[PDB]
UniProtKB/Swiss-Prot annotation, chains A, B:
This is Cholinesterase. The gene is BCHE. Esterase with broad substrate specificity. Contributes to the inactivation of the neurotransmitter acetylcholine. Can degrade neurotoxic organophosphate esters. Inhibited by mercury. Inhibited by Tabun. Tabun forms a covalent adduct with Ser-196 that becomes irreversible upon aging. It is linked to Butyrylcholinesterase deficiency: An autosomal recessive metabolic condition characterized by increased sensitivity to certain anesthetic drugs, including the muscle relaxants succinylcholine or mivacurium. BCHED results in slower hydrolysis of these drugs and, consequently, a prolonged neuromuscular block, leading to apnea. The duration of the prolonged apnea varies significantly depending on the extent of the enzyme deficiency. Tacrine binds at residues 80, 436.
Amino acid sequence: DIIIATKNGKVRGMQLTVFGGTVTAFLGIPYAQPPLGRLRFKKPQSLTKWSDIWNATKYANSCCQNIDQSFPGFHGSEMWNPNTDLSEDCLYLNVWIPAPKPKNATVLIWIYGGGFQTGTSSLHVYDGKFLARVERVIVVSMNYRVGALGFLALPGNPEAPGNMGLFDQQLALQWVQKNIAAFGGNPKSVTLFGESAGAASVSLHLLSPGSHSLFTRAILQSGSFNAPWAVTSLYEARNRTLNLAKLTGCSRENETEIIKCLRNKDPQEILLNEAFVVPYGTPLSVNFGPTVDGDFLTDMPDILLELGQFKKTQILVGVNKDEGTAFLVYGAPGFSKDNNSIITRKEFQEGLKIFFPGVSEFGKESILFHYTDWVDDQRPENYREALGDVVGDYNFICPALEFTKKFSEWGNNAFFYYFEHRSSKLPWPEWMGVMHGYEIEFVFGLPLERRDQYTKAEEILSRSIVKRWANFAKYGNPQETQNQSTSWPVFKSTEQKYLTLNTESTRIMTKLRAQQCRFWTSFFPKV
Amino acid sequence: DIIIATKNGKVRGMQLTVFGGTVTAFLGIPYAQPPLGRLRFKKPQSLTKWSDIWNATKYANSCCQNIDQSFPGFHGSEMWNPNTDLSEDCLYLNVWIPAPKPKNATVLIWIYGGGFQTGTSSLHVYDGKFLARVERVIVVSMNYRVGALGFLALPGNPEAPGNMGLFDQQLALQWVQKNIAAFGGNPKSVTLFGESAGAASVSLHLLSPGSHSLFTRAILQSGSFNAPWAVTSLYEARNRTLNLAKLTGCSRENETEIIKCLRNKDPQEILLNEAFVVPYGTPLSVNFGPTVDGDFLTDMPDILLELGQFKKTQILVGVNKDEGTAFLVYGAPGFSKDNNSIITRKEFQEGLKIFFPGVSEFGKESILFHYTDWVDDQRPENYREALGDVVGDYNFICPALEFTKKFSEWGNNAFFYYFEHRSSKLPWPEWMGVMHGYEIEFVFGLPLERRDQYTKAEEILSRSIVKRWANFAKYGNPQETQNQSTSWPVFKSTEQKYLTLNTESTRIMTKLRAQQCRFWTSFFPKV
Ligand SMILES: *[C@@H]1O[C@H](CO[C@H]2O[C@@H](C)[C@@H](O)[C@@H](O)[C@@H]2O)[C@@H](O[C@@H]2O[C@H](CO)[C@@H](O)[C@H](O)[C@H]2NC(C)=O)[C@H](O)[C@H]1NC(C)=O
Ligand SMILES: *[C@@H]1O[C@H](CO[C@H]2O[C@@H](C)[C@@H](O)[C@@H](O)[C@@H]2O)[C@@H](O[C@@H]2O[C@H](CO)[C@@H](O)[C@H](O)[C@H]2NC(C)=O)[C@H](O)[C@H]1NC(C)=O
Ligand SMILES: *[C@H]1O[C@H](CO[C@H]2O[C@@H](C)[C@@H](O)[C@@H](O)[C@@H]2O)[C@@H](O[C@@H]2O[C@H](CO)[C@@H](O)[C@H](O)[C@H]2NC(C)=O)[C@H](O)[C@H]1NC(C)=O
Ligand SMILES: *[C@H]1O[C@H](CO[C@H]2O[C@@H](C)[C@@H](O)[C@@H](O)[C@@H]2O)[C@@H](O[C@@H]2O[C@H](CO)[C@@H](O)[C@H](O)[C@H]2NC(C)=O)[C@H](O)[C@H]1NC(C)=O
Ligand SMILES: *[C@@H]1O[C@H](CO)[C@@H](O)[C@H](O)[C@H]1NC(C)=O
Ligand SMILES: *[C@@H]1O[C@H](CO)[C@@H](O)[C@H](O)[C@H]1NC(C)=O
Ligand SMILES: *[C@@H]1O[C@H](CO)[C@@H](O)[C@H](O)[C@H]1NC(C)=O
Ligand SMILES: *[C@@H]1O[C@H](CO)[C@@H](O)[C@H](O)[C@H]1NC(C)=O
Ligand SMILES: *[C@@H]1O[C@H](CO)[C@@H](O)[C@H](O)[C@H]1NC(C)=O
Ligand SMILES: *[C@@H]1O[C@H](CO)[C@@H](O)[C@H](O)[C@H]1NC(C)=O
Ligand SMILES: *[C@@H]1O[C@H](CO)[C@@H](O)[C@H](O)[C@H]1NC(C)=O
Ligand SMILES: *[C@@H]1O[C@H](CO)[C@@H](O)[C@H](O)[C@H]1NC(C)=O
Ligand SMILES: [Cl-]
Ligand SMILES: [Cl-]
Ligand SMILES: [Cl-]
Ligand SMILES: [Cl-]
Ligand SMILES: [K+]
Ligand code: NA
Ligand code: NA
């Protein structure tokens, strides 16, 4: 029986057997008042205290969200859907600690992605018990509000100020600062890690002055806030909140009255209307996301980044080889997960209209010009591959590389990786390659479980990544020092060294996607 | 009708149509007295002059040599066998010039490989008409004596001084210095290029004071004189000449008498006994090769290299990804070109005894230790691949990299490549990969001929390599400047940048085979 006294009252955890050892899991500890009734769309309010023992022995409710129903019955998409009940009452977090209880362990805090519209901390691929067992770190993860309920903004109105889900994340970081030592953790050694919108969130904690003293360092897997889907302008945010009011019968002349009417709607009516607040969207649309609220975020984040106004610390950033392919089967014409998706030039063109809907004809022709000068045979897959690369370079890889360059120019060590291993169990088809999201299970150590039929080469790859990530959290340096491994060099402007992650051989390379990123970074923003 | 006046008399060439243009070929011009009767085993004597017109309209005799009969009827091995009559009368060279005749063209002089035991300039894959047509350079190639007839040595005795075939090469370089301007060539812009023993030969011309004023720069494809098969010690050379005498009935007390008796033997009796002058050999045995003769080579070449005593100029050096695989089917047990050659550990061990016959048990165990610590699954091909890498790293790649490091430390620009494209027409099986010898046809531009069924991607690769090699010869810098190509950086000690050559994407990488070469270069020589 493991019972821990926190600042809000006692919590009871449970013992898990993991690889011949034990891990103690405390699943579903509350970290804020449930944001119901009058609290809907406000910043999270802090917890009052319980007398008695809170049983943290099962995952809590996931936050309200739309679900992906594009492939019912299919593991490749269903594994990202929420696996506990959906509820507005969803502000909880999970703690995994080594047994015996550690003395001052480094803490890894995971922030899930999902476009800021979806996601939950309870998915199988985010289970922190392997990292706790193998590296003797404490792993923490939280649920945070998503969609309009997390990110609706009428900027400057404290009834719906924006960024509520980022404030939920921040309050969970505060919870670790105040309580993690009772679990054996060191509040002075806390690394954030997250993937896609979870990575963009981590990068915004580097910018937010209220997060500055709540963590030590940061890991960004496939995402950063300069990615084109990550931050909503003030103008589109007010537009979208007003469209949402229109669609739900809540248009009013007084803005505080709009919010009060939105607070009377059942969650389902809000969720049903979210897709439509925008005149056209894409597979990557973030309808309700982070905004410049003058609170969490004090200025446009591209200005803060450019002028060095962010926490000075080490970062670990990287991307997967085929980031853009997952998105093509959610609307590009000619694509299917159930065939080889060979498309024509005309299809490629229609595909750019799907992913770049507000963009000029010239802008879309510029994309086609840059990506279709082929090397070289008339390969059938030319256009299929070009579209996946357009979408992955624009939305993920070039923005991660630009973020890492700009961050590292202010004097801190940064380490960049390119993940290029396709999981032997991947249920999506071969043409999609090394997809977005599919490094996560290697990071959390799932291939360390021999019972699961990953290959031996994947066990070794995951074991090495897990060690590099734990060394980065503990020591700021993501080396694997014992097994004659390739040394991971810092990423600097000028040389731009990165490390490739694969089952065969790790290589130091330079200037990832140089010619493509010059296009997206220096030309495309003009268009 | 094209007739050119040389210093020895007139020669008549022939016109070839190549890609909608014309090339003039002068095949089979003599450059020395035929080395017959009393001249057998002596240095080549210079030509006397003919009155009348020498018809250089067909390839000349190849020098006497044993032939590869291991796979009769098989193109993969037969393409390297000689395709003109074998004769002691074989000191001729070929000249290809652009039409119309150029004004002061750069000259590329090809030196074929063949272990110093075999080879000829007339093979299809060395046909210089494509380079002359496309890059408007003059290409020259020579036959040089091989085997005992080229390299027998009784060191210091001018009846058989050693290095005769290197002196044949040198006299052909002298011939170009004196005559190439009559063909439109520039004698001040002459680049040597060669592969395997042809590359080792080129590297020895960099060391030989009599070659210094005969060329400008050098290209070394898969070979250098520090490779373990390239130079015979004085002691094994005298041993081998004496064994040859024993086997032919020519043992005498007076050494000049041994030579005179060897001069009475028919060539065939000499060729038949060459395999046996050594108590055991390997697939890579060079029984009669370059020696330290105090003439061509004034000291041990490792000393000259180490102390900077060589021509100061630019070099282009490189190797193929699977250099060692071709040799495994000429005697390693379990290997066959007609199956996947999966071998066991015991086979791997027997295989080291085949390739390292004079080496201690400890030495052979050290090889096995270094190459069999696997990453990682129990892959069936582990031992098959390890053997190909042992043989290719020891015999070709580590010595090319060490040569390039040591050369470049004295201040000259060097450029290193790693060739990693397997020809779509390769008649050897897939497990042999990117074999030794199979970059040659890309260098000479054979895939530029669309009629030959190489792929389009191979046409473009060859076109780019041909341009880099011609730019290196003409300008000392192997760039392809017009097609947004990767820039080829100089190879320096410290960084050791090299350029990968492939059909997909060219990359700049660093420290090729670092861990393996430390083994072969700093440890193995001790054993
Ligand atoms: C690969 O599939 C796509 C997707 O559409 C299909 O899914 C298939 C596996 C099959 O069940 C099919 O019936 C289903 O419609 C094909 O594109 C579709 O092609 C149809 C029929 O020609 C068009 O009229 C559709 O609009 C188009 N759908 C979409 C979303 O674009 C595609 O041609 C096929 N590609 C192959 C076989 O290479
Ligand atoms: C691949 O072939 C080798 C080579 O030997 C063979 O060539 C084959 C394609 C076939 O025609 C065969 O009859 C011929 O002998 C095999 O190694 C040989 O195996 C034999 C029979 O067991 C041994 O007794 C031989 O000594 C050995 N030869 C040599 C040179 O080592 C090899 O086993 C086979 N490998 C496979 C199928 O994976
Ligand atoms: C935000 O403001 C308007 C909102 O118009 C919308 O009405 C909402 C309630 C919702 O249903 C939404 O889908 C609908 O679009 C946008 O006006 C649109 O602009 C288009 C032309 O692109 C016109 O056709 C309409 O006025 C309207 N669209 C449709 C499909 O009827 C406006 O575009 C937007 N502001 C932005 C994008 O900055
Ligand atoms: C060079 O000198 C002798 C030469 O011995 C050889 O006689 C030749 C005419 C020829 O047929 C050759 O194959 C034969 O080996 C070498 O002596 C050998 O050493 C071995 C032991 O390894 C003994 O068994 C024999 O004396 C002889 N070999 C055989 C197979 O009979 C000597 O090794 C060599 N010098 C070197 C390698 O430096
Ligand atoms: C907490 O845990 C134990 C179950 O072992 C139980 O005695 C106690 O009542 C629990 N509290 C609940 C279910 O509310
Ligand atoms: C944990 O280590 C920190 C430094 O990282 C130190 O300041 C703190 O007091 C430690 N607490 C322990 C060992 O209980
Ligand atoms: C609008 O209504 C709110 C809600 O009661 C009220 O408090 C506020 O003072 C009013 N504001 C304006 C600008 O009219
Ligand atoms: C290092 O190698 C050992 C055994 O050689 C292995 O069991 C372990 O998984 C490796 N450790 C890491 C951190 O990769
Ligand atoms: C050289 O060439 C021509 C063939 O066109 C001929 O007239 C001449 O006799 C030739 N010399 C020979 C064959 O020796
Ligand atoms: C060829 O160029 C060289 C320099 O490389 C020059 O010295 C020589 O005289 C030239 N001859 C010509 C153009 O005929
Ligand atoms: C050996 O014979 C040669 C050949 O005629 C002769 O010229 C030479 O002087 C003799 N040399 C010795 C060392 O006896
Ligand atoms: C450069 O590109 C052109 C056409 O775009 C092509 O035809 C030519 O083969 C290329 N040249 C080289 C030297 O690679
Ligand atoms: Cl078009
Ligand atoms: Cl670079
Ligand atoms: Cl053993
Ligand atoms: Cl390096
Ligand atoms: K050793
Ligand atoms: Na479902
Ligand atoms: Na034959």
